[PDB]
Coordinates of C-alpha atoms in Angstrom, one line a residue:
Chain A
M7 CA 0.0 0.0 0.0
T8 CA 0.9 3.7 0.3
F9 CA 0.1 6.2 3.1
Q10 CA 1.2 9.8 3.3
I11 CA 0.0 12.6 5.6
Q12 CA -0.4 15.8 3.5
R13 CA -1.7 18.3 6.1
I14 CA -3.1 18.6 9.6
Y15 CA -5.2 21.5 10.7
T16 CA -7.9 22.7 13.0
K17 CA -11.1 23.3 11.1
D18 CA -13.0 24.6 14.1
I19 CA -12.2 25.6 17.7
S20 CA -14.7 26.5 20.4
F21 CA -14.2 27.2 24.1
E22 CA -16.8 28.7 26.5
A23 CA -16.9 29.5 30.2
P24 CA -20.4 31.0 30.4
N25 CA -20.4 31.2 34.2
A26 CA -16.6 31.8 34.1
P27 CA -16.1 34.8 36.5
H28 CA -18.2 33.4 39.4
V29 CA -17.8 29.7 38.8
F30 CA -14.1 30.2 39.8
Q31 CA -15.1 30.3 43.5
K32 CA -15.7 26.5 43.0
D33 CA -12.1 25.4 43.1
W34 CA -11.9 21.6 42.5
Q35 CA -11.8 18.9 39.8
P36 CA -14.9 19.5 37.6
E37 CA -16.8 16.4 36.3
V38 CA -15.9 15.9 32.7
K39 CA -17.8 14.4 29.9
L40 CA -16.1 13.5 26.6
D41 CA -17.6 12.9 23.2
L42 CA -16.1 11.8 19.8
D43 CA -17.1 11.9 16.1
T44 CA -15.2 10.8 13.0
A45 CA -16.1 11.6 9.5
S46 CA -14.2 11.4 6.2
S47 CA -14.5 12.3 2.5
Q48 CA -12.6 11.9 -0.8
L49 CA -11.1 15.2 -2.0
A50 CA -9.6 13.6 -5.0
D51 CA -8.3 10.2 -6.2
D52 CA -6.5 8.5 -3.4
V53 CA -6.6 11.8 -1.5
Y54 CA -9.0 11.8 1.5
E55 CA -9.9 14.2 4.3
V56 CA -10.5 12.8 7.8
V57 CA -12.1 14.9 10.5
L58 CA -12.0 14.2 14.2
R59 CA -14.5 16.1 16.4
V60 CA -13.9 16.1 20.1
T61 CA -16.3 17.7 22.6
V62 CA -15.6 18.1 26.3
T63 CA -18.3 19.2 28.7
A64 CA -17.2 20.1 32.2
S65 CA -19.2 21.1 35.3
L66 CA -18.6 22.1 38.9
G67 CA -21.4 21.3 41.3
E68 CA -24.6 21.7 39.5
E69 CA -23.4 24.3 37.0
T70 CA -21.3 24.5 33.8
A71 CA -17.5 25.1 34.3
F72 CA -16.7 25.1 30.6
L73 CA -17.5 23.7 27.2
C74 CA -14.8 23.0 24.6
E75 CA -15.0 21.5 21.2
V76 CA -12.5 21.0 18.4
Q77 CA -12.7 19.6 14.9
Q78 CA -9.3 18.4 13.9
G79 CA -8.8 17.6 10.2
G80 CA -6.2 16.1 8.1
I81 CA -5.6 15.4 4.4
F82 CA -4.1 12.0 3.7
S83 CA -3.1 10.0 0.6
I84 CA -4.3 6.4 0.7
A85 CA -3.6 3.9 -2.1
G86 CA -3.7 0.1 -2.5
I87 CA -6.0 -0.4 0.5
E88 CA -9.7 -0.6 -0.2
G89 CA -13.0 -2.1 1.0
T90 CA -12.9 -2.8 4.7
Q91 CA -9.2 -2.1 5.1
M92 CA -9.9 1.4 3.8
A93 CA -12.9 2.0 6.0
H94 CA -10.6 1.1 8.9
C95 CA -7.9 3.4 7.7
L96 CA -10.2 6.4 7.6
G97 CA -12.3 5.5 10.5
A98 CA -9.7 4.3 13.0
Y99 CA -6.1 4.7 11.7
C100 CA -6.3 8.4 10.7
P101 CA -8.4 9.6 13.6
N102 CA -5.8 7.9 15.9
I103 CA -3.1 10.1 14.2
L104 CA -5.3 13.2 14.8
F105 CA -6.3 12.5 18.4
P106 CA -3.1 13.9 19.9
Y107 CA -3.7 17.3 18.1
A108 CA -7.3 17.6 19.2
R109 CA -6.4 16.5 22.7
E110 CA -3.7 19.1 23.0
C111 CA -5.9 21.7 21.6
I112 CA -8.4 21.0 24.2
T113 CA -5.8 21.0 27.0
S114 CA -4.5 24.3 25.7
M115 CA -7.9 25.9 25.6
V116 CA -8.7 24.6 29.1
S117 CA -5.4 26.1 30.4
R118 CA -6.1 29.5 28.8
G119 CA -9.5 29.6 30.6
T120 CA -7.5 29.0 33.9
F121 CA -9.2 25.8 34.7
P122 CA -7.6 22.7 36.3
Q123 CA -5.4 20.6 34.1
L124 CA -7.4 18.4 31.7
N125 CA -5.7 15.4 29.9
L126 CA -7.9 13.3 27.7
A127 CA -7.3 9.6 28.3
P128 CA -6.0 7.7 25.3
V129 CA -8.7 6.4 23.0
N130 CA -8.7 3.0 21.3
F131 CA -10.1 3.9 17.9
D132 CA -9.7 0.3 16.7
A133 CA -12.1 -0.8 19.4
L134 CA -14.5 2.1 18.6
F135 CA -14.4 1.1 14.9
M136 CA -15.4 -2.5 15.8
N137 CA -18.6 -1.0 17.4
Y138 CA -19.4 1.1 14.3
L139 CA -19.9 -2.2 12.5
Chain B
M27 CA -4.1 53.8 45.2
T28 CA -3.6 50.2 44.4
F29 CA -3.5 48.1 41.2
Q30 CA -3.4 44.3 41.2
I31 CA -3.9 41.8 38.5
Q32 CA -5.7 39.0 40.2
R33 CA -6.3 36.8 37.2
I34 CA -6.1 36.6 33.4
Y35 CA -8.3 34.2 31.4
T36 CA -10.1 33.7 28.2
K37 CA -13.9 33.6 28.8
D38 CA -14.6 32.5 25.2
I39 CA -12.7 31.4 22.1
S40 CA -13.9 30.7 18.6
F41 CA -12.0 29.8 15.5
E42 CA -13.7 28.8 12.2
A43 CA -12.3 27.8 8.8
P44 CA -15.5 27.0 6.7
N45 CA -13.8 26.2 3.4
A46 CA -10.8 24.9 5.1
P47 CA -9.8 22.0 2.9
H48 CA -10.0 23.9 -0.4
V49 CA -9.3 27.5 0.8
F50 CA -5.7 26.3 1.2
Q51 CA -5.4 26.1 -2.6
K52 CA -6.4 29.8 -3.1
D53 CA -3.6 32.3 -3.4
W54 CA -2.9 34.2 -0.1
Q55 CA -4.4 37.6 -0.9
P56 CA -6.5 38.2 2.4
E57 CA -8.3 41.2 3.7
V58 CA -8.1 41.2 7.5
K59 CA -10.8 43.1 9.3
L60 CA -10.3 43.8 13.0
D61 CA -13.1 44.7 15.5
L62 CA -12.4 45.5 19.2
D63 CA -14.9 45.8 22.0
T64 CA -14.4 46.5 25.7
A65 CA -16.6 46.1 28.7
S66 CA -16.0 46.4 32.4
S67 CA -17.9 45.3 35.5
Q68 CA -17.6 45.5 39.3
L69 CA -17.6 42.1 40.9
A70 CA -17.0 43.3 44.4
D71 CA -15.8 46.4 46.2
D72 CA -12.6 47.4 44.4
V73 CA -12.7 44.2 42.3
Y74 CA -13.4 44.7 38.7
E75 CA -13.6 42.4 35.6
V76 CA -12.5 43.8 32.2
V77 CA -13.2 41.9 29.1
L78 CA -11.6 42.6 25.8
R79 CA -13.2 41.0 22.7
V80 CA -11.1 40.8 19.6
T81 CA -12.7 39.7 16.4
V82 CA -10.7 38.9 13.3
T83 CA -12.0 38.1 9.9
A84 CA -9.9 37.1 6.9
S85 CA -11.2 36.9 3.4
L86 CA -9.8 35.9 0.0
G87 CA -12.3 38.1 -2.0
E88 CA -15.8 36.8 -1.2
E89 CA -14.6 33.5 0.3
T90 CA -13.9 33.7 4.0
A91 CA -10.6 32.2 5.0
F92 CA -11.2 32.1 8.7
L93 CA -13.0 33.9 11.6
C94 CA -11.4 34.3 15.0
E95 CA -13.0 35.6 18.1
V96 CA -11.6 35.8 21.5
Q97 CA -12.9 37.2 24.8
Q98 CA -9.9 37.9 26.9
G99 CA -10.9 38.7 30.4
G100 CA -9.1 39.8 33.6
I101 CA -9.9 40.4 37.2
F102 CA -8.3 43.5 38.8
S103 CA -8.0 44.9 42.3
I104 CA -8.4 48.6 41.9
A105 CA -8.7 51.3 44.6
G106 CA -7.8 54.8 45.4
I107 CA -9.2 56.4 42.2
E108 CA -12.5 57.3 40.7
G109 CA -14.4 59.3 38.1
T110 CA -12.5 59.8 34.9
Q111 CA -9.4 58.3 36.4
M112 CA -11.1 55.0 37.1
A113 CA -13.0 55.2 33.8
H114 CA -9.6 55.5 32.0
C115 CA -8.2 52.6 34.0
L116 CA -11.0 50.3 33.0
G117 CA -11.4 51.5 29.5
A118 CA -7.8 52.0 28.4
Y119 CA -5.2 50.8 30.9
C120 CA -6.8 47.5 31.7
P121 CA -7.6 46.5 28.2
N122 CA -4.0 47.5 27.2
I123 CA -2.8 44.9 29.7
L124 CA -5.1 42.3 28.2
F125 CA -4.3 42.9 24.5
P126 CA -0.9 41.1 24.4
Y127 CA -2.6 37.9 25.7
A128 CA -5.5 38.2 23.2
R129 CA -2.8 38.7 20.5
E130 CA -1.0 35.4 21.3
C131 CA -4.3 33.5 21.6
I132 CA -5.2 34.6 18.1
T133 CA -1.8 33.9 16.6
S134 CA -2.0 30.4 18.1
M135 CA -5.5 29.7 16.7
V136 CA -4.5 31.0 13.3
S137 CA -1.4 28.9 13.4
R138 CA -3.4 25.8 14.4
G139 CA -5.7 26.5 11.4
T140 CA -2.4 26.3 9.4
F141 CA -2.7 29.8 7.9
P142 CA 0.2 32.2 7.6
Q143 CA 1.2 33.9 10.8
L144 CA -0.9 36.8 12.1
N145 CA 0.3 39.1 14.8
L146 CA -2.2 41.9 15.6
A147 CA -0.7 45.4 15.5
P148 CA -0.6 47.3 18.8
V149 CA -3.6 49.4 19.6
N150 CA -3.7 52.9 21.0
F151 CA -6.3 52.4 23.7
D152 CA -5.6 55.9 25.1
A153 CA -6.7 57.3 21.7
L154 CA -9.9 55.2 21.4
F155 CA -10.8 56.2 25.0
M156 CA -10.4 59.9 24.1
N157 CA -12.6 59.6 21.0
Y158 CA -15.4 58.2 23.2
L159 CA -14.6 60.6 26.1
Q160 CA -15.5 63.5 23.8
Chain C
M13 CA -3.4 -10.8 29.2
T14 CA -3.7 -7.3 30.6
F15 CA -2.6 -4.0 29.1
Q16 CA -3.4 -0.5 30.3
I17 CA -1.8 2.8 29.6
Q18 CA -1.2 4.6 32.9
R19 CA 0.4 7.8 31.8
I20 CA 1.9 9.6 28.7
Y21 CA 4.4 12.4 29.3
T22 CA 7.3 14.2 27.7
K23 CA 10.5 13.6 29.6
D24 CA 12.7 15.9 27.4
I25 CA 11.8 18.4 24.7
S26 CA 14.3 20.3 22.7
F27 CA 13.9 22.7 19.8
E28 CA 16.7 24.8 18.4
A29 CA 16.9 27.2 15.4
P30 CA 20.6 28.4 15.6
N31 CA 20.6 30.2 12.3
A32 CA 17.4 32.2 13.0
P33 CA 16.3 34.7 12.0
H34 CA 18.6 35.0 8.9
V35 CA 17.8 31.5 7.8
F36 CA 14.1 32.6 7.4
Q37 CA 15.3 34.1 4.1
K38 CA 15.0 30.7 2.6
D39 CA 11.3 30.2 2.3
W40 CA 11.0 26.6 0.9
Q41 CA 10.6 23.1 2.3
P42 CA 13.4 22.0 4.7
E43 CA 15.1 18.6 4.1
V44 CA 14.3 16.5 7.2
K45 CA 16.4 13.7 8.7
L46 CA 14.7 11.5 11.3
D47 CA 16.3 9.3 13.9
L48 CA 14.5 7.1 16.4
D49 CA 15.7 5.5 19.6
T50 CA 13.8 3.4 22.1
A51 CA 14.3 2.0 25.6
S52 CA 12.4 0.6 28.6
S53 CA 12.6 -0.4 32.2
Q54 CA 10.4 -2.2 34.8
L55 CA 9.1 0.0 37.6
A56 CA 7.2 -2.7 39.5
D57 CA 5.6 -6.1 38.7
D58 CA 3.7 -5.8 35.5
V59 CA 4.5 -2.1 35.2
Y60 CA 6.9 -0.7 32.7
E61 CA 8.1 2.6 31.4
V62 CA 8.8 2.9 27.6
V63 CA 10.6 5.9 26.3
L64 CA 10.5 6.9 22.6
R65 CA 13.2 9.3 21.5
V66 CA 12.5 11.1 18.2
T67 CA 15.2 13.3 16.7
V68 CA 14.6 15.6 13.8
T69 CA 17.4 17.4 11.9
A70 CA 16.2 19.9 9.3
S71 CA 18.2 22.1 7.0
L72 CA 17.6 24.7 4.3
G73 CA 20.3 24.8 1.6
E74 CA 23.6 23.9 3.2
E75 CA 22.7 25.3 6.6
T76 CA 20.7 24.1 9.6
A77 CA 17.1 25.2 9.7
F78 CA 16.2 23.5 13.0
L79 CA 16.9 20.6 15.4
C80 CA 14.0 19.1 17.2
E81 CA 14.2 16.3 19.7
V82 CA 11.6 14.7 21.9
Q83 CA 11.5 12.0 24.5
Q84 CA 8.0 10.7 24.8
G85 CA 7.5 8.3 27.7
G86 CA 4.7 6.3 29.0
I87 CA 3.9 4.0 31.9
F88 CA 2.1 0.8 31.0
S89 CA 0.5 -2.1 33.0
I90 CA 1.5 -5.3 31.2
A91 CA 0.6 -8.8 32.5
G92 CA 0.0 -12.2 31.0
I93 CA 2.7 -11.8 28.4
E94 CA 6.2 -13.2 28.5
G95 CA 9.6 -13.8 26.9
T96 CA 9.8 -12.8 23.2
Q97 CA 6.2 -11.4 23.2
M98 CA 6.9 -9.0 26.1
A99 CA 10.1 -7.7 24.4
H100 CA 8.1 -7.0 21.2
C101 CA 5.3 -5.3 23.2
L102 CA 8.0 -3.1 24.8
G103 CA 10.2 -2.5 21.7
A104 CA 7.4 -2.1 19.2
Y105 CA 3.8 -2.1 20.4
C106 CA 4.4 0.6 23.0
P107 CA 6.7 2.8 20.9
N108 CA 4.0 2.7 18.2
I109 CA 1.5 3.9 20.8
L110 CA 3.8 6.8 21.7
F111 CA 4.7 8.0 18.2
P112 CA 1.3 9.9 17.6
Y113 CA 2.1 12.1 20.7
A114 CA 5.7 12.6 19.6
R115 CA 4.6 13.7 16.1
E116 CA 2.1 16.2 17.5
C117 CA 4.7 17.6 19.8
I118 CA 7.2 18.0 17.0
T119 CA 4.6 19.6 14.7
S120 CA 3.8 22.1 17.4
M121 CA 7.4 23.2 18.1
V122 CA 8.2 23.4 14.4
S123 CA 5.2 25.7 14.1
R124 CA 6.3 27.8 17.1
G125 CA 9.6 28.1 15.2
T126 CA 7.6 29.5 12.3
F127 CA 8.9 26.9 9.8
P128 CA 6.8 25.0 7.2
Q129 CA 4.5 22.3 8.8
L130 CA 6.1 19.0 9.6
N131 CA 4.0 15.9 10.1
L132 CA 6.1 12.9 10.7
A133 CA 5.3 9.9 8.5
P134 CA 4.0 6.8 10.3
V135 CA 6.6 4.2 11.3
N136 CA 6.3 0.4 11.2
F137 CA 8.0 -0.5 14.5
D138 CA 7.4 -4.2 13.9
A139 CA 9.9 -4.0 11.0
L140 CA 12.3 -1.8 13.1
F141 CA 12.2 -4.4 15.8
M142 CA 12.7 -7.5 13.8
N143 CA 15.7 -5.8 12.1
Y144 CA 17.0 -5.0 15.6
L145 CA 16.8 -8.6 16.7
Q146 CA 18.7 -10.0 13.7
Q147 CA 21.5 -7.6 14.9
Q148 CA 22.8 -8.9 18.2
Chain D
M3 CA 6.9 56.3 16.0
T4 CA 6.4 53.7 13.2
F5 CA 6.0 50.3 14.8
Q6 CA 5.2 47.1 13.1
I7 CA 5.5 43.5 14.2
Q8 CA 7.2 41.5 11.4
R9 CA 7.4 38.0 12.9
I10 CA 7.3 36.2 16.3
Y11 CA 9.1 32.9 16.8
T12 CA 10.8 30.7 19.3
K13 CA 14.5 30.4 18.7
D14 CA 14.9 27.8 21.4
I15 CA 12.9 25.6 23.7
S16 CA 14.2 23.1 26.3
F17 CA 12.3 21.0 28.8
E18 CA 13.9 18.4 31.0
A19 CA 12.5 16.2 33.8
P20 CA 15.5 14.0 34.7
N21 CA 13.7 12.0 37.4
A22 CA 10.4 12.1 35.6
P23 CA 9.0 8.7 36.4
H24 CA 9.8 8.7 40.1
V25 CA 9.2 12.4 40.7
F26 CA 5.5 11.9 39.8
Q27 CA 4.9 10.1 43.1
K28 CA 6.5 12.8 45.3
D29 CA 4.8 15.3 47.6
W30 CA 4.0 18.3 45.4
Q31 CA 5.6 21.2 47.2
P32 CA 8.0 22.8 44.6
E33 CA 10.2 25.9 44.8
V34 CA 9.5 27.6 41.5
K35 CA 12.3 29.9 40.4
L36 CA 11.8 32.3 37.5
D37 CA 14.5 34.1 35.5
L38 CA 13.9 36.7 32.8
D39 CA 16.6 38.0 30.4
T40 CA 16.2 40.3 27.4
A41 CA 18.5 41.2 24.5
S42 CA 18.1 43.1 21.3
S43 CA 20.0 43.7 18.1
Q44 CA 19.7 45.5 14.8
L45 CA 19.2 43.4 11.7
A46 CA 19.0 46.2 9.1
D47 CA 17.7 49.8 8.8
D48 CA 15.0 50.3 11.4
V49 CA 14.6 46.4 11.7
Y50 CA 15.3 45.0 15.1
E51 CA 15.3 41.5 16.7
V52 CA 14.2 41.3 20.3
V53 CA 14.7 38.1 22.3
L54 CA 13.1 37.3 25.6
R55 CA 14.6 34.4 27.5
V56 CA 12.5 32.9 30.3
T57 CA 13.9 30.2 32.6
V58 CA 11.8 28.2 35.0
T59 CA 13.2 25.8 37.6
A60 CA 10.9 23.6 39.8
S61 CA 12.6 21.8 42.7
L62 CA 11.4 19.7 45.7
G63 CA 14.6 20.5 47.6
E64 CA 17.6 19.2 45.7
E65 CA 15.3 16.9 43.7
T66 CA 14.8 18.7 40.4
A67 CA 11.2 18.3 39.1
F68 CA 11.8 20.0 35.8
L69 CA 13.8 22.7 34.1
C70 CA 12.2 24.7 31.3
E71 CA 13.8 27.5 29.2
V72 CA 12.5 29.5 26.3
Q73 CA 14.1 32.0 23.9
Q74 CA 11.2 33.9 22.3
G75 CA 12.1 36.1 19.5
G76 CA 10.5 38.8 17.5
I77 CA 11.5 40.9 14.5
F78 CA 10.2 44.5 14.6
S79 CA 10.2 47.4 12.3
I80 CA 11.0 50.6 14.3
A81 CA 11.5 54.1 13.0
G82 CA 11.1 57.6 14.3
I83 CA 12.4 57.2 17.9
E84 CA 15.9 57.0 19.2
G85 CA 17.9 57.4 22.4
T86 CA 16.0 56.7 25.6
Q87 CA 12.8 56.3 23.6
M88 CA 14.2 53.6 21.3
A89 CA 15.9 51.9 24.3
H90 CA 12.6 51.6 26.2
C91 CA 10.9 50.3 23.1
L92 CA 13.5 47.5 22.9
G93 CA 13.8 46.7 26.6
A94 CA 10.2 46.8 27.8
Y95 CA 7.6 47.4 25.1
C96 CA 8.8 44.6 22.7
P97 CA 9.4 42.1 25.5
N98 CA 6.0 42.9 26.8
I99 CA 4.7 41.8 23.4
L100 CA 6.8 38.6 23.6
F101 CA 6.0 37.6 27.2
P102 CA 2.6 36.0 26.4
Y103 CA 4.1 33.6 23.8
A104 CA 7.0 32.7 26.1
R105 CA 4.6 32.2 29.0
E106 CA 2.3 30.0 27.0
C107 CA 5.2 28.0 25.7
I108 CA 6.3 27.2 29.2
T109 CA 2.8 26.4 30.3
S110 CA 2.4 23.9 27.4
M111 CA 5.8 22.2 28.0
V112 CA 5.0 21.7 31.7
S113 CA 1.6 20.4 30.8
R114 CA 3.2 18.0 28.2
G115 CA 5.4 16.7 31.0
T116 CA 2.2 16.0 33.0
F117 CA 3.3 18.3 35.9
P118 CA 0.8 20.6 37.7
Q119 CA -0.3 23.8 35.9
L120 CA 2.3 26.6 35.9
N121 CA 1.0 30.1 35.0
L122 CA 3.6 32.8 35.1
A123 CA 2.3 35.9 36.8
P124 CA 2.2 39.1 34.7
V125 CA 5.5 41.0 34.4
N126 CA 5.9 44.8 34.6
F127 CA 8.6 45.2 32.0
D128 CA 8.4 49.0 32.5
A129 CA 9.3 48.6 36.2
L130 CA 12.3 46.3 35.4
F131 CA 13.5 48.8 32.8
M132 CA 13.6 51.5 35.4
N133 CA 16.2 49.5 37.5
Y134 CA 18.5 49.0 34.5

């Protein structure tokens, strides 16, 4: 086969601390909720675009601490592979490459908002793909 | 008198690259529009919040390259002054303290989008305050 | 068998652009040389640390553009595996898990250096290990 | 004065956590030491490079938790001022512009090393300039 990463970029970034000023009085580890989405598309022949969307909802007590979302995209060149092997390349292999980027983006945004450190636990995309089927 | 930065933080951040995949093919001939907005607030006696909103729009003709908005806030302990003095501090001095941080947040977002570097030009807040002041 | 990632962290990060800013006068794609190095060590029973060292040497023309090095470590819980299989999980499986984070780290520092984007190409550690074995 | 930011970039970044593994299970009571240094130089007519070096040391006694250093550069077009005015622009105004990027850079490195959040307090480059 043939695989080549052509570009990696953030298509969309969002961070919100609606109750920010006053919710700071609540100093502790906020309950976090993570959500993932992966969608691809063919930009040209053997040139695809995979997008990884990661949403993190956090709350302190009974109120929102912050909401953060990121859509991390990448352009890849895939050849030789096809059928199921391809579905797995774009649905698990590429998102796995992009996860570190989205993860860091979220960590950076959370840090900018002056909230407690937030490190997304590693995700097994291979396992997640096995549930998509 | 007493000035004290108690906290610097981004209340909101938004970056959008609608035609992301393809807009990278277009030649880099952007029109960058900048919009600034300021708002203060008393949170407690002598404790004020100042929020600087910086909005950046970049277009390649009629096709938007990316939109960046950032609400850079800060909590300040101010005391000993009032009237126009305090008004100047919250409308010019404080936002001037916040701009450098909003600048870096925007550069970082733009760089994450994988667009050419963008470093906002300094802003004369003392001049914008005067225009309003009279 | 049991396998859980307990932590991912950077033990050492290094970025250097010795010829900056004059070297920025060369606005084209840098040639990139990549070097990998791995290692591990047991911390307890069924607990191991694996460290992946990625070194990137880039140059524009006949002069250095930048040097970037990263030591990406991780602590893993591994049980139910032994002998040759454990050595491969440590010298290949784990390094392969750490590479994604090392790439993102390198991309980020290269971007902070304001050089063209660098996204390291995937690496087949299985091949790199088998080649390592037939050399001892 | 004719001021214009031409480019901002890190010339050097270094992060080290020698006893990384073990140090993670130690009682978090570090002695954070910060050190700021600033230098400048002319590149061409009215074009200057300003470099802000930030050094952070985190120790639990003699047990170093991590050492982080960043050299944050910036190329600036400056014309119209000179003497004390130009001197202040290079030693405080420009560094003030670079501090957010050096601060963020340190924050990220420390976060990447999975150590507790480290947010450098604001710096009054105008006050430091007075001393000099």
